[PDB]
């Protein structure tokens, strides 16, 4: 029972701790620390006097807390994407688990020859683009290089965006803002895309169409929904049909945790679903 669910959870969070602390020893700080402590415009140097101002604040007011106290289920998100691409290579098991799987498909004949694509050695700072976020939380981690974009931000730093909205156009490295609010972003650029904004048809399937295209090879999709139970099997397939596989399901307390992985080849993942389509399966992702 729950027993389980809190004893991996105080786990993780565990294991999140020791890994966060090494990795800050080696990075020295994080991402928005050291883009930010070297001002190019005078809106740079405002936006670091502002910062020296609110550390100076945080400083003398309170002690043993940092404002910002991240979420234990975003703690578990951090864990995963450090053992998936650092700690424990689980790209590489699931390049292995995959392969083989193609090599028994080609075996039956039931998968032609395929070109596919892989992913070169993990970057020192992963590109992490956190969609629908509230207060950028990735960017605590030293690790990440966090894109981070809301329908409506709160924080300077947060870019506005519908995700529904944007075009995904290969050949640029960076977002295009035009108007304030962004309109073009690069394609298959991010390690990992986080849809923090949960999704709740047509609209809650395309927003996945993006990610995919959005990700690198063999990149990441981490889905974070409450426990507010075979529909997870039921677009499951349907994930698969866009190209994903489910990598990671983890059942902490009250919140239900996913990851996906861009396979190394989408016809792949495509004939699987066709093998594992549960007869009544919608080709669409509802509720």
């Given at each position: 029972?729950?027993?389980?669910?809190?004893?991996?959870?105080?786990?993780?969070?565990?294991?999140?701790?020791?890994?966060?602390?090494?990795?800050?020893?080696?990075?020295?700080?994080?991402?928005?620390?050291?883009?930010?402590?070297?001002?190019?415009?005078?809106?740079?140097?405002?936006?670091?006097?502002?910062?020296?101002?609110?550390?100076?604040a945080i400083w003398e007011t309170n002690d043993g807390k940092w404002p910002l106290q991240a979420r234990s289920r975003i703690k578990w998100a951090i864990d995963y994407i450090t053992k998936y691409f650092f700690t424990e290579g689980i790209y590489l098991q699931k390049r292995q688990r995959e392969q083989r799987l193609l090599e028994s498909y080609r075996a039956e004949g039931k998968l032609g020859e395929v070109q596919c694509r892989l992913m070169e050695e993990p970057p020192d700072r992963l590109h992490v683009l956190d969609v629908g976020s509230?207060?950028?939380?990735?960017?605590?981690?030293?690790?990440?290089?966090?894109?981070?974009?809301?329908?409506?931000?709160?924080?300077?730093?947060v870019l506005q965006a519908d995700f529904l909205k944007v075009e995904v156009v290969p050949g640029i490295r960076?977002?295009?803002?035009?108007?304030?609010?962004?309109?073009?972003?690069p394609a298959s650029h991010y390690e990992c895309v986080i849809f923090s904004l949960l999704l709740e048809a047509e609209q809650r399937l395309q927003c996945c169409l993006q990610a995919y295209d959005l990700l690198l090879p063999e990149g990441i999709?981490?889905?974070?929904?409450?426990?507010?139970?075979?529909?997870?099997?039921?677009?499951?397939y349907?994930?698969?049909?866009?190209?994903?596989?489910?990598?990671?399901?983890?059942?902490?307390?009250?919140?239900?945790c996913m990851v996906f992985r861009k396979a190394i080849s989408r016809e792949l993942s495509q004939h699987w679903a066709s093998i594992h389509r549960e007869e009544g399966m919608c080709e669409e992702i509802r509720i």
């Open positions: 029972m729950a027993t389980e669910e809190h004893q991996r959870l105080a786990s993780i969070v565990k294991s999140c701790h020791e890994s966060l602390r090494q990795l800050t020893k080696e990075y020295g700080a994080t991402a928005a620390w050291q883009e930010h402590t070297s001002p190019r415009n005078a809106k740079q140097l405002a936006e670091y006097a502002k910062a020296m101002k609110q550390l100076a509230c207060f950028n939380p990735f960017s605590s981690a030293p690790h990440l290089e966090v894109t981070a974009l809301d329908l409506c931000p709160a924080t300077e730093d960076e977002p295009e803002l035009e108007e304030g609010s962004v309109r073009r972003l999709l981490v889905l974070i929904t409450p426990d507010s139970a075979h529909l997870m099997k039921n677009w499951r349907s994930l698969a049909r866009i190209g994903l596989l489910r990598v990671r399901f983890e059942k902490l307390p009250h919140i239900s």
